[PDB]
Design a protein around this nucleic acid. Sequence first.
RNA 1: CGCGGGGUGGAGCAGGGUAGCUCGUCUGGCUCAUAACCAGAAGAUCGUCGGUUCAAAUCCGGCCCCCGCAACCA
RNA 2: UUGAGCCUUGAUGUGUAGGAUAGGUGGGAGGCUUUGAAGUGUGGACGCCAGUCUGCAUGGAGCCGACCUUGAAAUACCACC
RNA 3: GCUUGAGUCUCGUAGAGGGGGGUAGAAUUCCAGGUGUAGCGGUGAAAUGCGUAGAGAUCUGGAGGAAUACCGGUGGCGAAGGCGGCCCCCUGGACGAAGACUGACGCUCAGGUGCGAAAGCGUGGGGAGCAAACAGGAUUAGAUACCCUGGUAGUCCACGCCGUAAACGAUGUCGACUUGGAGGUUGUGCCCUUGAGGCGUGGCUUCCGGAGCUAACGCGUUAAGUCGACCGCCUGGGGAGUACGGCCGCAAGGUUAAAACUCAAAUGAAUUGACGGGGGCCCGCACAAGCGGUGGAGCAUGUGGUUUAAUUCGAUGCAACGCG
Lengths: 116, 95, 65, 155
Amino acid sequence: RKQVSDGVAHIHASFNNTIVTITDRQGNALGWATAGGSGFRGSRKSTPFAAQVAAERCADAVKEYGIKNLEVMVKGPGPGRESTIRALNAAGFRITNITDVTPIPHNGCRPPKKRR
Amino acid sequence: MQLNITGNNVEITEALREFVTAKFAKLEQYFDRINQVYVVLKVEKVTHTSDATLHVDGGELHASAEGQDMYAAIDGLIDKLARQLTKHKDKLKQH
Amino acid sequence: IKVRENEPFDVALRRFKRSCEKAGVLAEVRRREFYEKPTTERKRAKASAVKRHAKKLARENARRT
Amino acid sequence: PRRRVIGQRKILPDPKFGSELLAKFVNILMVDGKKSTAESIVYSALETLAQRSGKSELEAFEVALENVRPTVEVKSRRVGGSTYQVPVEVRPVRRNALAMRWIVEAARKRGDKSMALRLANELSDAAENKGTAVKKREDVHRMAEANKAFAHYRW
RNA sequence: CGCGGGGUGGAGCAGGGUAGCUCGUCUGGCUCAUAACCAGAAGAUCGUCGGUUCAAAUCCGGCCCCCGCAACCA
RNA sequence: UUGAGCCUUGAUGUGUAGGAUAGGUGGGAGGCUUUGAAGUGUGGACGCCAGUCUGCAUGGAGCCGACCUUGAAAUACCACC
RNA sequence: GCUUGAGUCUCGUAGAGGGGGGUAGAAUUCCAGGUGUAGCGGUGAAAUGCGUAGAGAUCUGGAGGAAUACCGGUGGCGAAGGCGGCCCCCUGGACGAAGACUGACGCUCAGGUGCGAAAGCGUGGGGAGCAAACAGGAUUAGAUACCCUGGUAGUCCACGCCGUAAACGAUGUCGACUUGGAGGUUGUGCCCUUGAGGCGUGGCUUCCGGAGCUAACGCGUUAAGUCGACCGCCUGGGGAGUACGGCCGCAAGGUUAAAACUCAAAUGAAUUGACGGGGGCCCGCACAAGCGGUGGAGCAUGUGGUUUAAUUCGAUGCAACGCG
């Protein structure tokens, strides 16, 4: 329960799927929703509209916590990543920060081969 | 697949008719499903020439081959049609 | 990268900062070490960059219109 | 076509009512170019609409048409090596013409005895929204709203 | 040879006041077709009988099938 | 920290009909109240989002049962659960 | 003898030049814990795979390996191969300014000697990610491949071996000479450093072009121009950089290097076409948007085929088949 007020809304933004989860300031999660679980499967999982439906399905089931302000973390080069945040300020939230936290290696491990 | 064998100055025998259909059974399954075939055999004082008009789900394709003794002409005709059938097949796959 | 701007919400002011160097980098770490093609592509790049310098300087003679 | 935004020509209106919208409607079911046979069926089908609905005749026709006209239409779009059904919003001059074509193709099936009453039954049932003409509109919207994932426009 | 558990669309199964979902099978759309996905519909007297109250897939009896645990030292 | 069991209690059990979130059965028109009433400062639970409980009042001396519909009449009151 | 070639020294300057040791942050993976719940992952679509034994997402902590984002530059350095975080230690060369010094000490080399990407090999470690082989899922007529999910050698370290690459600038080394332009990088001189100013002068380097050269493409002061010194190499295509022999190597193999036979060509550059599942632009009932047909029915007619004594002959993809 705990009725927390300010939270963090992480957005995983892979190419094939967009995952949006909502946590608090401390970092432990509250609820999540994906674009593959919103009824979109296959070619339509990589659509910015499917990231919007994943957002409003995650904007519900956190009414139990009562969030009115949250930060936004985006991670990945996805087709969503900005249509998700438009489905949150329209859902009645105060977006204090929007932050890019995508992982960039300062040249570390070897990626796979280019597919032909 | 329906064969229609026809000869201009080459009256087709029974051994030649089954030689066409056994050869046209090859370029069958192995390359594409087809609707209807018209085969035309011609002899023009030197050239045993064999034509063929295939009808497929997309359009039509035609090939001709002149040869040596009317058996190598159809053997060159199928290799001309089989390459046009693989080019047409991958034109309709585009994966 | 980090926008904590006030007033009216419109990332608009976010994609100015973020579409700067946050997607060209992740799409090129996406796959293949290359180890020698960077070289090829790099060297093809500037042979076409001076193709824009040494032609557009020579294109200011006339325009036939 | 490639060129030629076509110079559009006009239609002469209906004699009995001052409308070209119903004159467009009589031209659709006019089979083999027989207009007197076409106009006799539609006049016998809308006087039947008045007694079976209570209202006046011509405005009972479009209230069966706003219940059957669509707002979005889905198309096949060729992109990449495949082709998916992208939805697009309909222009209004096509919107009514797509509606009254759906009425006639439902009127040639749904086989009752005469053509005048075959049209007269579902022009009522378009207003009560249980006929098979409205089930064409709702199953078009069922496919367009399922394909809301394809579009660079948000309206 | 008694204690338990389960009998529900073709199957797998959800579910004291109304029978649901995936597949398969019936189509629509699309595809070059099979497909894949999308969109609707049929699919049950809930194993069979009785009664327990207004009303039972639900609760209680007996029967049939099945899975278990034993009693298995004539 | 935590199951499970017992006791002391305190809540809760909207099909339909319908004035109503009525658990069952039985006794059943007397209790409630100024041990400072409805409205609400208020705070929650439940939430089958419709209604009930409790904390404190600045109000202050009121409310139901039989009489309306229901297979059933009222946590009106009490008892067994 | 001489100082102009070559070299030494004195001051500096730039540099991913090399070898050794330390260390930092980002990220991947794994492990542990918290929260949290039905999906994740993947693809053109899909499945294998993962997940109700709690994945994925998210947060904290830890372990370990490899690689150094941005800077990063037709930038720099090195004989070539090659060399990128940062710090220290040892160390090689290049270059410039002003002198001083030795006095042809030079150039190039068959053999020889050393260095030499990646893969591979041996012994001993290490092993995150990636990934031959291999395994499964797809695609397909088939798919032993491309794609997907996994995944072992290998990639990493130390010490040896191998001695090969389209090891390329497909251009040996050295020296001299012969119109220019735009730069990059790095020293330095003078004048008003009086201002990121102006004039010069070196080194390396990139591009474009003149003469000339070249079969043409192109090269063009860093030549493929004009010359000189020496070395390597070539002699039609296949056979064949193969056989045999020698040498070298643990092995893989390297190196040296034929002949029989066979062909009248092989080849280079450019030209015009044609074609491209290359690019741009445009048109046509070509598609789309619609209407009505065919294919299914009986019949009319033409053809193929069969039949017949003859079923006259010709027309055969589009452009023959209600055609002569």
